[PDB]
Write a protein that binds this ligand. Structure first.
Ligand SMILES: Nc1ncnc2c1ncn2[C@@H]1O[C@H](COP(=O)(O)OP(=O)(O)OP(=O)(O)O)[C@@H](O)[C@H]1O
Ligand SMILES: Nc1ncnc2c1ncn2[C@@H]1O[C@H](COP(=O)(O)OP(=O)(O)OP(=O)(O)O)[C@@H](O)[C@H]1O
Ligand SMILES: Nc1ncnc2c1ncn2[C@@H]1O[C@H](COP(=O)(O)OP(=O)(O)OP(=O)(O)O)[C@@H](O)[C@H]1O
Lengths: 433, 416, 112, 416
């Protein structure tokens, strides 16, 4: 019964929504964390004006630091900062202004209980007085070839506002200083901060230690949990340590490892079960193979005999072709030819079905949907709504020409088939030309 | 809590365009005093002092109007990058001149009627500043045309000043109709020299260099004139700042920002050693600001990438060498990585690295056609802007190209 | 496209109902007009319709059978032989159609 | 917090994964969750099966399949969330917001914020599991759409007592691989094995067929005396195994096609049932053989055409598959798509092969063929036959041209 308390405590720490007094800052992040915190405190406590962009890939803990700093400062300066949040994906170049207008009023309501828009905002702040905080995710989206009036005004307000003004930007591009136009680039304070990447296995081991340890006596098994965690992080031959090393070698986004670990803690039913699972550490293999179950090999292992034979025949035509193109007629011709060959190599007796061309249509439809084939020049999923509009307006020839003559290209080359297809398969001998 | 200011606060808190000021004022005074209408064109790179000089000219013309050397006039300031829509210019201009709130179509016609038809004696002189004029360009370029066209009307009594990126823009982008009206009245602002940047910094810090302060030993709060402390900034530090910035851009803001950055660095040095007699801002403080402006994080970030990303870039470079091409299909790279693994396959740990890359070190996973996290690193390089990928829903014929320069990639691979 | 098809079908349905623009109109039809709905979709010329759009629109209409107050009937006008449709539609849709279908010749040359 | 788990067969791992990431406390659940699997994988079945065992979870169900574009998808979220909140907690005084006012995602965020503020008086923080089934099945879809719903709830105020916890279901793998860097918790559905599909069909569609009217007739007609429900179950079960083993290489491993085949062939198989057919299903197989020898998914002298039309369609095929080089020699690439040609060639070849001059009946038959779509043109809208830009091609396979040649006694087989 009491195991549930610790099991929930572990998950609550894992998701990261801890109280500011209980929250964790990883060691390798602390330098940039203090660099950000100094600017934030200068802008809020000491009424300075600044503009900063944070750099780093997605899931690099970039916004977590800002959230931690604001949650810290809300304890002592609750009445002295206003936060404005804008996201590049949701807010367009039009909807940003309305978002700012609504959020300013929303903050002011709980506080009290564009040539002139920004100036009137400043005048309202002056007449009601508080430091205005701007947070931007996906700066590159705002910094596109579309006119950058929003950031142009925001960075101009830094050294001209009668009210303290601070701007934080978030993006993953490294060429940010070329994304921003020369007009905007000039006005920006250019104190670019690059998030510290994990660069040693010691960094990741310490991050795991910080993340999974329990610092308070929530449960009587907290001492056992911390000790077991440190033991498994200590012995180099631990299964968990091996998996952590593999993660570090493969990809260095820590939240991926966090999300991988979450099911292990969540599924645990008892402390003994938790200890056995974390020692064996076998369920990460199951998770990883399920991550791989809908890959090319996973889809290929599920096909039927006739589907596999038609796939092999299509691959052979693609291989013989100069451009790799093929169609239904050639595929069925090769299927008939290989069935004839297989029958011929079986001696005739003195006194295998070639499926009808109509029945093979269902097999063709199955394979086209499972993405083993693709249309000659299929762009696939378009990038943006305007591209989707122009795509849906147009009528492609490949959708009009008959089912038997649509041109396709192959995704699994015959060599990959020979790697994957078991040799016990009857059609395996045709995986060679 | 009290706002604590250290000795460096005044340095962070805190005359070069007189000839340009005189030239603009001379033309403006001649046109305004004669009750005429004309178009004034201003161009230059950002941060050289265009807008500030124009504001100084306008303020001094108002001073002349206060002295009644010239008659009264009305000033309107418009920035092209502050408008929500281009049509708002017509509404805003008529709103300031007349106080009305008509639509853009009515206001544009009202402005056309006002400048052309209304008698001169029934008007007040109007001066308009169209900041970021090149940002107001529409498909029909009417904003570029109509405002300057109204200055050709002798009854307008209208003065229009425009700020644009380039001097020869009317010839490069506008028609002969607009270009002739603008004519010869154009003025250009050139970026400052290093000594001018040094002079501006010294002027901003005229009363602060070598000055004494009273500084609270318990909090670090400083009062310009508890113990007596002095502050200084190295002249060579200013010189190396001025020379570096002037070799990069004429933007005066960068030179001011560097001094603020250097002062902030010195402030950190002061606070770190004290843990809250002359505080000289040293050339190392300036060079630190210059270093972060020049150095690029690309190479170190690449050297800090995971193993799979480095292997991807190495294989792509190997294909670039073996093919002499700029882009390689994933059909090439996926099996070129296999080739590079196989060539060294005679080594024992190559078996373990293959088990990691193709079965993730588990027996329950069968052979994969992609290395583990192929998609992850492929997207991550695209997310960081390192890599360029073309849209195609085929996982083999899709082409991949480096966005970064080749030599820095080679250097990053060498350091592994 | 399917977007236009559903919109126009709902427009005609609403016009008829008010003479006495999406699937919610079918869902809320009884709560609006108090009567059950029976739809007869008359495909006036199958041989000229983009079979992809029709194939997807049939699957779209397939969701309407969740409602107990709606019934649908489809009429196909074919100039060529019946098998010309079988080549162009996907075999998933043919299995939907085949469960309840009737075949009728309306030519004027019926046996002299 | 603890959530009970239904025993969904062949989805045990995914049921455990949905026991994870879903709980009463919003501090123990993620902002986004994706379940992925191709059609006929059980995701819509399994998710509803899991929610049907834990009513306390407040789930909202929507289907982009019905909602054609993104505007209906946005509006339905607000509508259904508002209605569900009224259904759950009615006593709180609230004010309605029109779901048709949601024209932008920002407006969706605004409306959600307003609704949660209206419920702020709630004692405890609670989850709101908004569910979207088949996100990629949306017909008006683009890549940039999904990020807008990934990064949505962080714009909501975290103080709100109601927290939205999105759940998505997806079909394609090429959709997931553009969003792998986000590390979103993902639960995967692989295609079922044959042993799984057969048992799923036996468990699901056995009793429904077992008591249909068709058997309600035949049982009495054959005067079965010792029949019990177990015999019914076994006899019905044998049918599914027979159809699966007969048509597995044709359908594949899809439940839908097997269900449709069972639906079509079940009355006919029941028809063959006699007194001696039950208790020996081998005889049932040995009498209904022709059901298992043809798919019978077909919807039903195949073409009855005029002689002029027949020869026109012969000549058009000759034009479409004979290279233009041979028109001056023979008369004086089957697997490939047909090449284009001109009417001038068609008329000449038709005149050269018919056993006719230029009476209107020839052109009438040609236009009839085009209306029959036995011959295609290079246009889609506003057909303009007489315009010179249009070109012609054959839309008929060889297997029909051969029969036409036989019916008109022509020898196309000797021209190639
Ligand atoms: N309020 C929060 N509480 C707990 N964890 C959080 C919070 N906000 C973010 N995180 C953590 O942040 C990690 C991902 O990084 P983060 O959210 O900071 O990046 P981001 O802002 O999405 O990045 P980018 O804009 O560069 O794509 C996740 O592992 C998540 O747990
Ligand atoms: N001669 C100068 N002396 C002091 N400060 C100057 C001088 N020239 C420019 N500055 C500083 O540069 C700032 C920007 O100047 P200004 O508004 O004229 O920009 P600009 O040259 O038109 O360029 P941008 O297009 O980037 O606005 C001013 O606020 C001022 O502090
Ligand atoms: N474990 C199972 N046991 C029994 N029946 C199952 C099982 N899994 C799936 N099914 C069957 O699968 C059928 C198809 O529903 P399913 O949930 O598979 O659709 P789907 O893959 O979400 O479809 P779509 O992509 O068209 O929305 C259901 O009618 C259900 O009976």
């Amino acid at each position: 019964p009491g195991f549930g308390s610790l099991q929930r405590r572990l998950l609550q720490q894992l998701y990261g929504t801890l109280p500011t007094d209980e929250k964790i800052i990883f060691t390798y992040l602390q330098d940039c964390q203090q660099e950000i915190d100094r600017i934030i405190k200068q802008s809020i406590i000491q009424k300075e004006s600044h503009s900063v962009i944070l750099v780093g890939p997605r899931q690099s803990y970039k916004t977590y630091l800002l959230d931690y700093e604001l949650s810290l400062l809300q304890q002592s300066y609750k009445e002295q900062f206003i936060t404005i949040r804008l996201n590049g994906f949701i807010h367009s170049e039009q909807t940003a202004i309305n978002g700012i207008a609504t959020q300013l009023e929303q903050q002011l309501q709980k506080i009290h209980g564009l040539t002139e828009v920004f100036e009137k905002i400043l005048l309202l702040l002056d007449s009601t007085t508080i430091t205005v905080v701007f947070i931007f995710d996906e700066i590159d989206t705002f910094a596109g070839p579309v006119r950058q009036t929003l950031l142009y005004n925001l960075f101009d307000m830094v050294e001209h506002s009668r009210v303290p003004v601070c701007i934080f930007g978030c993006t993953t591009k490294l060429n940010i200083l070329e994304y921003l136009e020369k007009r905007v680039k000039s006005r920006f304070s250019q104190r670019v901060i690059y998030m510290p990447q994990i660069q040693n296995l010691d960094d990741m081991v310490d991050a795991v230690r910080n993340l999974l340890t329990v610092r308070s006596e929530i449960s009587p098994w907290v001492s056992q949990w911390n000790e077991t965690l440190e033991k498994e992080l200590s012995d180099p031959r631990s299964n968990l340590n091996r998996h952590i090393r593999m993660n570090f070698e493969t990809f260095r986004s820590l939240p991926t490892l966090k999300n991988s670990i979450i099911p292990l803690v969540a599924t645990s039913k008892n402390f003994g079960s938790l200890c056995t699972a974390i020692k064996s550490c076998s369920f990460l293999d199951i998770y990883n193979k399920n991550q791989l179950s809908n890959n090319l090999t996973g889809r290929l292992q599920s096909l039927s005999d006739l589907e596999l034979a038609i796939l092999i025949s299509a691959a052979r035509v693609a291989l013989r072709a100069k451009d790799g193109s093929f169609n239904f007629n050639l595929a069925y011709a090769e299927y008939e030819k290989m069935i004839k060959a297989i029958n011929s190599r079986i001696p005739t007796v003195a006194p295998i079905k070639l499926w009808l061309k109509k029945d093979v249509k269902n097999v063709w439809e199955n394979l086209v949907q499972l993405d083993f084939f693709t249309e000659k020049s299929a762009v696939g999923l378009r990038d943006n709504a305007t591209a989707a509009f122009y795509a849906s307006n147009y009528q492609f020839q490949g959708t009009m020409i008959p089912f038997d003559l649509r041109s396709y290209q192959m995704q699994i080359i015959l060599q990959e088939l020979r790697r994957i297809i078991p040799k016990s398969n009857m059609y395996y001998s045709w995986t060679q030309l | 809590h009290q706002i604590v200011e250290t000795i460096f606060s005044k340095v962070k808190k805190q005359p070069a365009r007189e000839n340009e000021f005189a030239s603009i004022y001379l033309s403006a005074y001649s046109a305004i005093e004669s009750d005429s209408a004309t178009t004034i064109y201003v161009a230059g790179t950002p941060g050289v002092g265009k807008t500030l000089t124009v504001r100084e000219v306008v303020k001094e013309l108002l001073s002349s109007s206060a002295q009644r050397e010239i008659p009264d006039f009305l000033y309107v300031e418009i920035n092209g990058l502050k408008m929500v829509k281009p049509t708002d210019c017509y509404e805003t201009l008529w709103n300031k001149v007349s106080g009305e709130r008509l639509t853009w179509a009515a206001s544009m016609e009202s402005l056309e009627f006002y400048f052309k038809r209304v008698p001169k004696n029934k008007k007040k002189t109007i001066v308009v500043l169209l900041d970021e004029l090149d940002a107001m360009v529409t498909k029909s370029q009417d904003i570029m045309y109509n405002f300057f066209n109204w200055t050709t009307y002798e009854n307008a009594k209208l003065i229009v000043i425009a700020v644009a990126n380039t001097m020869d823009l009317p010839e490069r982008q506008l028609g002969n109709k607009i270009t002739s009206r603008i004519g010869f009245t154009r003025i250009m602002f050139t970026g400052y020299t290093h000594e001018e940047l040094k002079n501006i910094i010294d002027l901003r810090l005229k009363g602060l260099n070598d000055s004494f302060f009273y500084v609270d030993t318990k909090t670090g709060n400083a009062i310009l004139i508890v113990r007596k402390v002095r502050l200084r900034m190295s002249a060579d530090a200013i010189e190396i700042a001025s020379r570096k910035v002037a070799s990069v851009s004429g933007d005066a803001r960068r030179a001011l920002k560097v001094c603020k950055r250097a002062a902030e660095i010195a402030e950190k040095h002061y606070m770190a050693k004290h843990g809250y007699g002359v505080q000289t801002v040293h050339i190392t403080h300036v060079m630190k600001a210059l270093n972060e402006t020049l150095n690029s994080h690309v190479i170190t970030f690449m050297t800090r990438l995971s193993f799979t990303a480095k292997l991807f870039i190495y294989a792509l470079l190997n294909l670039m060498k073996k093919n002499g091409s700029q882009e390689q299909e994933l059909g090439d790279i996926v099996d070129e990585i296999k080739l590079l693994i196989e060539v060294n396959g005679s080594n024992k740990f190559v078996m373990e690295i293959a088990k990691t890359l193709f079965q993730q070190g588990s027996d329950n996973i069968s052979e994969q056609l992609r290395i583990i996290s192929w998609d992850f690193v492929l997207n991550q390089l695209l997310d960081a802007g390192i890599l360029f990928k073309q849209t195609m829903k085929n996982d083999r014929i899709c082409c991949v190209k480096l966005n970064i320069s080749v030599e820095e990639a080679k250097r990053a691979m060498n350091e592994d | 496209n399917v977007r236009m098809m559903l919109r126009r079908s709902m427009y005609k349905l609403y016009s008829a109902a008010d003479a006495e623009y999406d699937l919610s109109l079918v869902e809320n039809f009884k709560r609006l007009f108090g009567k059950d709905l029976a739809m007869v979709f008359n495909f006036k010329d199958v041989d000229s319709i983009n079979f992809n759009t029709l194939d997807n629109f049939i699957i779209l209409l397939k969701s309407a059978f969740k409602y107990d107050h709606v019934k649908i009937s489809l009429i196909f006008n074919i100039n060529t032989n019946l098998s010309n449709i079988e080549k162009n539609l996907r075999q998933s849709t043919i299995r939907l159609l085949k469960r309840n279908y009737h075949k009728l010749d309306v030519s004027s040359n019926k046996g002299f | 917090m603890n959530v009970t788990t239904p025993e969904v067969a062949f989805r045990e791992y995914q049921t455990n994964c949905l026991a994870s990431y879903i709980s009463a406390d919003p501090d123990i659940t993620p902002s986004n969750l994706i379940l992925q699997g191709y059609s006929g994988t059980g995701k819509t079945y399994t998710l509803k099966k899991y929610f049907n065992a834990n009513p306390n979870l407040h789930a909202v169900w929507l289907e982009p399949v019905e909602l054609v574009s993104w505007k209906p998808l946005l509006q339905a979220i607000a509508r259904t969330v508002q209605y569900k909140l009224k259904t759950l907690y009615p006593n709180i005084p609230t004010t309605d917001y029109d779901p048709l006012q949601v024209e932008e995602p920002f407006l969706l965020v605004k409306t959600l914020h307003n609704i949660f503020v209206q419920y702020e008086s709630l004692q405890e923080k609670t989850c709101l599991f908004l569910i979207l089934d088949g996100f990629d099945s949306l017909q008006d879809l683009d890549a940039a759409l999904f990020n807008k719903y990934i990064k949505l709830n962080e714009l909501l105020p975290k103080d709100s007592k109601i927290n939205i916890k999105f759940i998505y279901t997806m079909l394609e793998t090429s959709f997931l691989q553009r969003y792998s860097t986000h590390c979103i918790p993902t639960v995967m559905f692989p295609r079922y094995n044959v042993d799984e599909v057969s048992t799923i069909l036996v468990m699901s569609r056995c009793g429904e067929l077992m008591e249909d009217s068709c058997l309600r007739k035949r049982i009495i007609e054959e005067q079965i005396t010792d029949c019990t429900d177990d015999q019914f179950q076994n006899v019905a079960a044998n049918f599914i195994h027979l159809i699966v083993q007969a048509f597995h290489s044709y359908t594949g491993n899809d439940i839908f096609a097997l269900n449709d085949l069972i639906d079509f062939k079940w009355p006919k198989y029941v028809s063959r049932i006699t007194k001696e057919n039950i208790f020996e299903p081998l005889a049932l197989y040995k009498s209904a053989i022709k059901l298992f020898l043809s798919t019978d998914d077909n919807l039903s002298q195949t073409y009855d055409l005029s002689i002029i039309s027949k020869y026109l369609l012969i000549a058009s095929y000759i034009c479409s598959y004979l290279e233009p080089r041979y028109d001056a020699s023979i008369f004086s690439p089957r697997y490939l798509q047909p090449s284009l040609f001109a009417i001038e060639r068609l008329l000449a070849i038709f005149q050269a092969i018919f056993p006719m001059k230029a009476n209107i009946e020839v052109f009438q038959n040609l236009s009839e063929l085009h209306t029959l779509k036995l011959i295609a043109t290079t246009m889609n809208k506003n057909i303009d036959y007489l315009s010179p830009k249009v070109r012609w091609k054959v839309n008929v396979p060889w297997e029909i041209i051969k029969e036409i040649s036989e019916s008109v006694h022509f020898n196309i087989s000797d021209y190639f």
